[PDB]
Amino acid sequence: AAAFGVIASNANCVWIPASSGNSNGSGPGQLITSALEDVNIWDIKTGDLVSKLSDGLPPGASDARGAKPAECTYLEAHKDTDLLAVGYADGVIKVWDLMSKTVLLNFNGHKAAITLLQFDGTGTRLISGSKDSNIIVWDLVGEVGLYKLRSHKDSITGFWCQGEDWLISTSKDGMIKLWDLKTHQCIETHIAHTGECWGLAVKDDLLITTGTDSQVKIWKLDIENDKMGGKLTEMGIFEKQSKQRGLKIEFITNSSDKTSFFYIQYSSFILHPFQTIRSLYKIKSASWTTVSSSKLELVLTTSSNTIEYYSIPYEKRDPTSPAPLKTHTIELQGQRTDVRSIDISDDNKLLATASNGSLKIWNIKTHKCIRTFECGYALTCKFLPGGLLVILGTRNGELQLFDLASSSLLDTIEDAHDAAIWSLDLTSDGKRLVTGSADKTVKFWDFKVENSLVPGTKNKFLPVLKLHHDTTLELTDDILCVRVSPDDRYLAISLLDNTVKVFFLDSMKFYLSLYGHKLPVLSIDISFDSKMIITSSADKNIKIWGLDFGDCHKSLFAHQDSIMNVKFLPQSHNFFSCSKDAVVKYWDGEKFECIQKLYAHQSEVWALAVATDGGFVVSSSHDHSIRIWEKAGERLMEALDLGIAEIEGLEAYNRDMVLIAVNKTPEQYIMDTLLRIRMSQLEDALMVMPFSYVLKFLKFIDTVMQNKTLLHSHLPLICKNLFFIIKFNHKELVSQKNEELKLQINRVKTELRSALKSTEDDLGFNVQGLKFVKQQWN
Amino acid sequence: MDPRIIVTTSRDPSTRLSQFAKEIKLLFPNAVRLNRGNYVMPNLVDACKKSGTTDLVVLHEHRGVPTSLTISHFPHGPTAQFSLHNVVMRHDIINAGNQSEVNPHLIFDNFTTALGKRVVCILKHLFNAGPKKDSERVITFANRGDFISVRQHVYVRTREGVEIAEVGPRFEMRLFELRLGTLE
RNA sequence: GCGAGCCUUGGCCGAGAGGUCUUGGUAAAAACUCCGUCGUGCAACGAGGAAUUCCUAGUAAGCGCAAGUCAUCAGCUUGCGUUGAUUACGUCCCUGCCCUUUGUACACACCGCCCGUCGCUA
Known part of the structure; x- marks a missing residue:
């Protein structure tokens, strides 16, 4: 068949919040x-959308972006504002x-995500510490073989001169x-912590540290045999970041205690009056201060899904905060x-999220x-049909x-409930309302204009x-999803006894209960052919049902996390799955197989619905936006030919006016092949040689x-090879001339017999020296 | 423990039996392929007593039923002959893939061990070639009464599926003459 | 050296069944050794290509005999006897398969910590 959706990065998405x-x-x-779930461009003093870098159509590339989802760690501009x-x-x-x-380039080699990223003062080096507990230096060519410094077990915080x-380095x-x-x-x-280094700042000459210990340690730059001058204890909670002024006449500090304070x-010590402020520090603990x-x-960056602007009380700056x-x-x-x-x-033009x-x-x-x-x-x-x-x-x-x-509320609908509303949907013309409630009943609601004694604009409650009171062991009376035929x-109802019950519009007669559910059900829907249904439960298992009971068609089980919503198509041919594991899957309503698996979701999807046009996808989320x-x-x-080729060349160097074997002397390679060779069958390689x-x-x-080197060899090796070649050939069968x-x-043999005779004399005194006190100790 | 196998034929070979002898030759590390200049040797007892071999396999052809597979344990002297049904045209092959030193699992179907246990005694004594004791191939012996079947198979596994591969020349045989051997 | 170790012509006698005599077509140890004579036309494919397989002594090849059904001819099969070369006596190079040592992304589970939802009670 044919299904919508694409494998591209963008389909007119507004998924970035x-x-x-x-x-x-x-x-x-x-x-x-600004670092956000994109790259965003703000004015420094007005707050307007200057520009925004996100997914889309870059000039000369497809399936490329300006910025990604899955929240940016750091974001900075180059000092010549040429590089992002x-x-x-x-x-x-x-x-x-x-x-x-x-x-321009893509930089990998990182086992984990970035915990540090900043330009250096040269611009030709970019330093990145990541959460795989090391540092990676970067060149404009991409030189990573310059320096990889790692002796850590956690991430790193402090850096460059x-x-x-x-x-320098301070780590977490x-x-x-x-x-x-x-x-x-x-x-x-130097260690003065027991936990995590949260923030770091050098002022101009003094390096303070901020960690879990709720204190401040100052440190001098020209340091050896640690320079300590004092500690500022107990702000009230552990400190998180700090910042120096660009004029370097003040130093502002911030913490998770909803306060920021500077030194002067x-x-x-803090020696400036602070009652001049008017725009008190923060409602949510902030991440970073600039x-x-x-x-x-x-400029303050908070964890309340937004960043803000203030000012610091001083005569040169604004003495209050705006x-x-x-x-x-x-x-x-x-x-x-x-x-x-x-x-x-x-009407495909009225779409509301709450x-x-x-x-x-x-x-x-x-x-x-x-x-x-x-x-x-x-x-x-729920909209009214007609919007x-x-x-x-x-x-x-x-x-x-x-x-x-x-924005005004016309009418507050009657709060006859005592618990929150799980489900609600209207009928076709939209005059009947069926709701989700734990009040052990189903509540029908009227609807019309306000021209009579029965309010349809306030939905007066006539039928009960x-x-x-169906008795079970899981939960008797709670409903999750209601569906109108x-x-x-008829009316379809979700129930907490792992069943569903089917009953027509008037007074209670029974059609069908469905059961076999290890977990209770999340959502139930109906096809517009009205012969087969689907049901979603908390057991990662999606069950298809027609009209039978107990004869299992198929256990639609291929999942790992909990299932939020699975729905049919608005013309009943494609049922789709949104879940907890941030992936949305298309499934053919006539078959059991999947046509498209859409995975471009990083945050949690809570709900997802497709309109009757079917040309776009509406998606509720945990980062509060919609991926169309x-x-x-x-x-x-x-x-040997290379080595004697070196020695003969070095002999007539200037007494008479190759990069690698390996070493400052090539002969070390000569022993190294003796080091690399196995102890067995070496005589077969030796006996070939002339x-x-x-x-x-x-x-x-x-x-x-x-x-006088015995570091890279030993005398039984040299005498071992010597004794092999004197076995092989020869002294007077290779030469008769002096x-x-x-x-x-x-x-050379005199040098050998003396060099071994030394150590032999050393042992020859050693063991007899050991015997004599053992004669006495009895 | 492990047997010792000698392949012995008449003087003149045919290609329809040359390929068949090479499949029986695929029973190494103890199967020796020997063509004799005589049809039978009068000293078959002598060399097997000399070399210490355990079994002799002789091939020929007759009319009452089709061609036979004769298997005889040398230190016991029994006579077990196996009427071959398919000797028409087998695959030209000396090997494919692995070695015959692999010890396969032994699978019998349609269990007859009242009088067919003597066949069970021989085939376990025959196809124990391989001290590996780890299954990488398998040979099935399916019965239909006096009918026997010999098929070689390899373990084929993908996406959790137990697949076999019909490999080697596919053999259909019937139980031909069992002469009562001696306790000697 | 394995063995025993068929269609008829015609004729004389007989009620009979048949018996008996002629005629004519059809069917059905080897190689070796020695001694003498002659000296290639194929009527038609005329020592058999691409390719492919197999082979280490009493073996390859060659030759004949006998048997099972035969007192009797398999386009079958099994035994028997005679003569009897050449080449590897290897290696692990290719190729293919095993057994050991070696190397490792990945990975049951245990530590501490961050993030997010909801909620208790003081």
């Missing part, structure tokens, strides 16, 4: 670029063009390690938090207006009536349907005996 800030980077001075560089929640670091959003040499394993740049060796490790005579590039403000400004969001992070329910209209405090109106990606009465999140949402009014179910058991035009003939869809001996001969191999060979023995190597042997 541009939220959850953790860091930032200053750019042109009048602007500032972001490390993400994956180990690959992505650099980007500054004018365009094409990619500004002198091309003489690095409670350690502060000292290293030189030339041939790196841990000269000294900087000093070792001074603003206008030299008058402070109200925080936020960017021009599309009304996706201009309001507060996550989406638990979505609802669909029949939050803790907002209802947001959408056509495709353009936001019309907000509606605010929310006393919680919404478990269910005139919308009906809301909050986490109070309250249903709310909202007009399409304005209640027989719900598309023929308007569609042999050896010859090597010895080479070794007499000239011997004449080339003894020069290396004279080389090591004049070299030659120079022949006279060389006569002194």
